[PDB]
A paper describes a structure:
Phage satellite P4 polarity suppression protein, Psu, a building block of the viral capsid, inhibits hexameric transcription termination factor, ρ, by presently unknown mechanisms. The ρ hexamer adopts an NTPase-inactive, washer-like, open-ring conformation until NTPs (preferentially ATP) are engaged and RNA is bound at the SBS, leading to ring closure and RNA entrapment inside the ring. Our cryogenic electron microscopy structures of ρ-Psu complexes show that Psu dimers clamp two inactive, open ρ rings and promote their expansion to higher-oligomeric states. ATPase, nucleotide binding and nucleic acid binding studies revealed that Psu hinders ρ ring closure and traps nucleotides in their binding pockets on ρ.
A ρ variant harboring a P167L substitution has been observed to bind Psu more tightly than wt ρ38,43. Consistently, we observed a more pronounced shift in the SEC elution volume for ρP167L-Psu mixtures, even in the absence of nucleotides, as compared to wt ρ. We, therefore, also determined cryoEM structures of ρP167L-ATPγS-Psu complexes. The results showed that ρP167L associates with Psu in a similar manner as wt ρ, with a preference for the complex II constellation. In complex II, two hexameric ρ rings are bridged by five Psu dimers that connect ρ(A) subunit 6 with ρ(B) subunit 2, ρ(A) subunit 5 with ρ(B) subunit 3, etc. ATP or ATPγS are bound similarly between all neighboring ρ CTDs in the ρ-ATP/ATPγS-Psu or ρP167L-ATPγS-Psu assemblies. The ρP167L-Psu complex exhibited a ~seven-fold higher mant-ATPγS affinity compared to ρP167L alone (Kd = 2.1 µM). The mant-ATPγS association and dissociation rates of the complex were more than five-fold and ~40-fold lower, respectively, compared to ρP167L alone. The drastic decrease of the mant-ATPγS dissociation rate in the presence of Psu suggests that, once nucleotide is bound, Psu effectively hinders its release.
Numbering used by the authors:
A (entry chain e), B (entry chain f): 4 to 190
The structure:
């Protein structure tokens, strides 16, 4: 049931990222409205700029968390699907790889690594040959709905908000500022 | 049908390498016979040493040629077996690997390479799990005999005889010496 946990964790990350995005958008629009209002509220403008930047940092963090959760759920789905496929086709698969897979138990570390590398890149070449002809690849029937709901790739609105990286000092400063802002807004 | 050409090239390499080995052994035992005797055949001993050196070089070259041919025939057999198994179960493997394999045709170079790497090392992890659970696998049914006469690995003699390497200058000098020796023996 770990796949369901990954799925709904990704859904929660999507929800949190969207909530952060609309909060930032509302703060941006009210900041522009107040700036265009010819108001003598310099302190108000400064603290709204601070809120804007805190919201941007929170949006970046949420987008990164959602992207990593998407990667994790895709990876676990791949693990399970390939695991059952290989569990069912393993006799033929290892028969096709007998010349460099037998004796794996007693082979040395360097020999084992060389053999698995040769098997791995030969299988890579086979995958490339199969993909060359240009057919259509479909989701597994058991796990089609979850992958369709999650999507093949994360939304482009999640990668453009994570293209810039924050230094650890910036990260901790923004964490303190966000905590202070949350405490102030809670009152 | 190149597998048969690889296999009888392997057999011819047996012929050549065994001929080099037993000719070198005969020359070595004859040299030791003449050295043990009281005969003052210093020129004979010198030319015998030259012959022994060029025969060791020829044995090394033959062992290297065997290693190359054996690796080539194993690679061809692996490619053919992967082609057959992949044409058999590509739909299932694509259903397993769909989360990052569909759309590969229109993806950019870097994305294509990253997806290939992720699929490839996921398959490597699956193969490691199969090896870990400890089930033994025999050779391919279709091509069992061709790859069981040649053996799982090249002979230990072909390995330790080819362990030492020669710089290209040594290779060309030894080629010239071998040509001169062949010309002298022919007449």
């Amino acid at each position: 049931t770990a796949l369901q946990q990954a799925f709904d964790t990704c859904q929660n990350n999507k929800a949190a990222w969207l909530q952060r995005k609309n909060e930032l958008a509302a703060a941006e629009q009210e900041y522009l409205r107040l700036l265009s209002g010819e108001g003598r509220n310099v302190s108000r403008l400064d603290e709204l700029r601070n809120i804007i930047e805190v919201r941007k940092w929170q949006v970046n963090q949420a987008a990164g968390r959602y992207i990593r959760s998407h990667e994790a759920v895709q990876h676990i789905s791949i693990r399970d699907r390939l695991n059952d496929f290989m569990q069912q086709h393993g006799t033929a698969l290892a028969a096709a790889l007998a010349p460099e897979l037998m004796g794996y138990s007693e082979l040395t570390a360097i020999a084992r690594n060389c053999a698995i590398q040769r098997a791995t890149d030969a299988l890579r070449e086979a995958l490339l040959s199969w993909l060359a002809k240009g057919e259509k690849i479909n989701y597994s029937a058991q796990d089609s709905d979850i992958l369709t709901t999650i999507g093949f790739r994360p939304d482009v609105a999640s990668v453009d908000d994570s293209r810039e990286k924050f230094t650890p000092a910036q990260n901790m400063i923004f964490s303190r500022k966000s905590a202070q802002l949350a405490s102030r807004q809670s009152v």
